[PDB]
From a paper:
Furin is one of the proprotein convertases (PCs), a family of subtilisin-like proteases involved in the maturation of many secreted proteins. PCs are Ca2+-dependent serine endoproteinases harboring a catalytic domain with structural homology to subtilisin. The so-called kexin/furin-like mammalian PC family members (furin, PC1, PC2, PC4, PACE4, PC5/6, and PC7) recognize multibasic substrate sequences and cleave after the common pattern (R/K)Xn(R)↓ (where n = 0, 2, 4, 6; X represents any amino acid; and “↓” marks the scissile peptide bond). The inhibitors induced a substantial conformational rearrangement of the active-site cleft by exposing a central buried tryptophan residue.
The displacement of Trp254 by the dichlorophenyl moiety and the interactions of the piperazine and piperidine as described for 1 were also observed for inhibitors 2–4, resulting in very similar binding poses. Accordingly, superpositions of the furin–inhibitor complexes with 1 and 2, 1 and 3, and 1 and 4 revealed very similar Cα root-mean-square deviation (RMSD) values of 0.04, 0.05, and 0.08 Å, respectively. Inhibitors 2, 3, and 4 contain negatively charged 2-methylbutanoic or propanoic acid substituents on the piperazine. Enzyme kinetics revealed similar or even higher potency of these inhibitors compared with 1. Interestingly, we found a well-defined water network that mediates interactions between the carboxylate groups of the inhibitors and positively charged residues of furin’s S1′ region. In contrast, for 3 and 4 one carboxylate oxygen interacts with two water molecules, adopting a favorable planar binding geometry. As the (3,5-dichlorophenyl)pyridine derivatives bind tightly to furin, we used single-cycle kinetic experiments to determine their off-rates. The dissociation of 1 and 3 from furin was slow (koff = (1.8 ± 0.6) × 10–4 s–1 and residence time τ = 92 min for 1; koff = (3.1 ± 2.2) × 10–4 s–1 and τ = 53.7 min for 3; Figure 2C and Table S3). The on-rates of 1 (kon = 4600 ± 2500 M–1 s–1) and 3 (kon = (9.6 ± 2.6) × 104 M–1 s–1) can be considered as slow and are likely to be influenced by a structural rearrangement needed for binding. A comparably high bioavailability of 2, 3, and 4 was reported in a bleomycin-induced lung fibrosis mouse model.
Numbering used by the authors: 109 to 581
Write the structure that this text describes.
């Protein structure tokens, strides 16, 4: 009964559907009746060609703004180089019109789509805050494919206004259910970048996404880190297919690439899920992703089983998004209990790092208090330390259930002597575990150099609830 789209380039959208299983299971969500109707997504990028023949029918001025020129119209700036085309490509991934004889289709081909023109100029904290905080009671999902430089030597995150915009978004946005911020984990793979050094993807408020190639491999541009939640397909080598979407100047492209093309596909899957249950909160959406994502046939040398029986990787998080499973589980989902936060200051004195430092601490996770957590969501190790060559450090955190999260891998290009100033390294790998018991922090100098420094603060911050657990996998 469900008729698949007839768009000319739809058969080339290999990642949406097919008889092989190398796809995001989007046609199963469309067949259940979910195509994005009533959901509003906004792309935070270099602008959106609102008059594109495959975007105009779904374009929403209420989901759009131009923060670079301070006006409501996010039309890109046209140049000979076609420099401002990325937002239009991302918009088509989410919501390109279906059955109109043009290009392919979006994952949520009936959703409303807009864009914030924010990257075609100087990106300041105010520019970021005004983009993240745009029309929060109209826009449901924000998709951002970029962040601090992916040079493998930067440590940066949202400054005060942008962090306040995330707080306001998840707390009061979407009628109090919370704005959904979808983020790409980064394109710094060739520079050996480690994505927990990017405070936007490392945030608990962003649902972070990495990439897999068509043949199920970790692409050259992928960044590994413990803050990633899940994966979508994107580009790989020149024998693997790429993303097919709308392009600038009313064109179609078959060569959209990078993790920056994975985040919009996740935003479209999240739009289908929100149509299936409009009452899902920002945390319910992250729980659905953890429970339904699929590791099968994704190749990595770090797949590990966590404390509740789920496989998790630093390259893929919980695995590939599965749109059919997401929309099926959303329908009767019971809203998670309010978020609890348990703060544990670990050190009794500063500790010399040297070649290797291990800090062990047994915690009760706020036993006997309103913030008692027996079911973890995100965990952070907020560290303050000095070190002469930052990139030589590797940091791991082991949970009481034995789950080893790499908080920071060695970054050869990071020569900074600035250390970390209360940097909140985050892991999603212990989701649903009981955080009571022994936690172990390991900081090691991965080089033969006689490096030196001191760890002056280690705060373990646990987020979660004390109810609603599933029987382990
Ligand atoms: C103390 C204080 O005030 N500090 C202020 C700083 C301000 C900076 N931030 C860090 C920071 C930098 C940053 O820089 C970018 C500029 N441009 C591009 N790009 C993408 C490739 N494009 C080409 C694509 C193609 O052609 O294919 C060309 C254009 N990407 C990144 N973008 C962001 C950011 C923020 C949000 Cl919210 C949404 C999105 Cl998306 C991104 C954040 C940290 C705080
Ligand atoms: Ca404008
Ligand atoms: Ca189309
Ligand atoms: Ca990065
Ligand atoms: Cl908080
Ligand atoms: Na910073
Ligand atoms: Na995140
Ligand atoms: Na384990
Ligand atoms: Na325990």
């Amino acid at each position: 009964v469900y008729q698949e789209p007839t768009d000319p380039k739809f058969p080339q959208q290999w990642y949406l559907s097919g008889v092989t299983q190398r796809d995001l299971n989007v046609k199963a969500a469309w067949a259940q009746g979910y195509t994005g109707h009533g959901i509003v997504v906004s792309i935070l990028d270099d602008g959106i060609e609102k008059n594109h023949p495959d975007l105009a029918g779904n374009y929403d001025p209420g989901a759009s703004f131009d923060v670079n020129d301070q006006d409501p119209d996010p039309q890109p700036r046209y140049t000979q180089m076609n420099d401002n085309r990325h937002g239009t490509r991302c918009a088509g991934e989410v919501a390109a019109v279906a059955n109109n004889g043009v290009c392919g289709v979006g994952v949520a081909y009936n959703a409303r789509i807009g864009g914030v023109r924010m990257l075609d100029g100087e990106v300041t904290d105010a520019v970021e805050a005004r983009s993240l905080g745009l029309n929060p009671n109209h826009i449901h999902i924000y998709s951002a494919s970029w962040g601090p430089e992916d040079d493998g030597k930067t440590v940066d995150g949202p400054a005060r206004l942008a962090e306040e915009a995330f707080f306001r978004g998840v707390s009061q946005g979407r009628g109090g259910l919370g704005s959904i911020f979808v983020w790409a984990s980064g394109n710094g793979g060739r520079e050996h970048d480690s994505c927990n050094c990017d405070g936007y993807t490392n945030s608990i408020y962003t649902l972070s996404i990495s990439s897999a190639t068509q043949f199920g491999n970790v692409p050259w541009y992928s960044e590994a880190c413990s803050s990633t939640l899940a994966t979508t397909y994107s580009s790989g080598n020149q024998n693997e297919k790429q993303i097919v979407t709308t392009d600038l100047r009313q064109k179609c492209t078959e060569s959209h690439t990078g993790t920056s093309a994975s985040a919009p596909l996740a935003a479209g899957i999240i739009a289908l899920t929100l149509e299936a249950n409009k009452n899902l909160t920002w945390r319910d959406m992250q729980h659905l992703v953890v429970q339904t994502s699929k590791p099968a046939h994704l190749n990595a040398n770090d797949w590990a089983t966590n404390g509740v029986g789920r496989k998790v990787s630093h390259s893929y998080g919980y695995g590939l998004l599965d749109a059919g499973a997401m929309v099926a589980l959303a329908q009767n989902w019971t809203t998670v209990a309010p978020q609890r936060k348990c703060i544990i200051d670990i050190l009794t004195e500063p500790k010399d790092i040297g070649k290797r430092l291990e800090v062990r601490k047994t915690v009760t996770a706020c036993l006997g208090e309103p913030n008692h957590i027996t079911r973890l969501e995100h965990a952070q190790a907020r560290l303050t330390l000095s070190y002469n060559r930052r990139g030589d450090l590797a940091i791991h955190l082991v949970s009481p259930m034995g789950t080893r999260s790499t908080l920071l891998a060695a970054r050869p290009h990071d020569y900074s002597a600035d250390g970390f100033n209360d940097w909140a390294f985050m892991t999603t790998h212990s989701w649903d575990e009981d955080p009571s018991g022994e936690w172990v922090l390991e900081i090691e100098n991965t080089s033969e150099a006689n490096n030196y420094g001191t760890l002056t603060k280690f705060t373990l911050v646990l987020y979660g609830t004390a109810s609603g657990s599933l029987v382990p996998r």
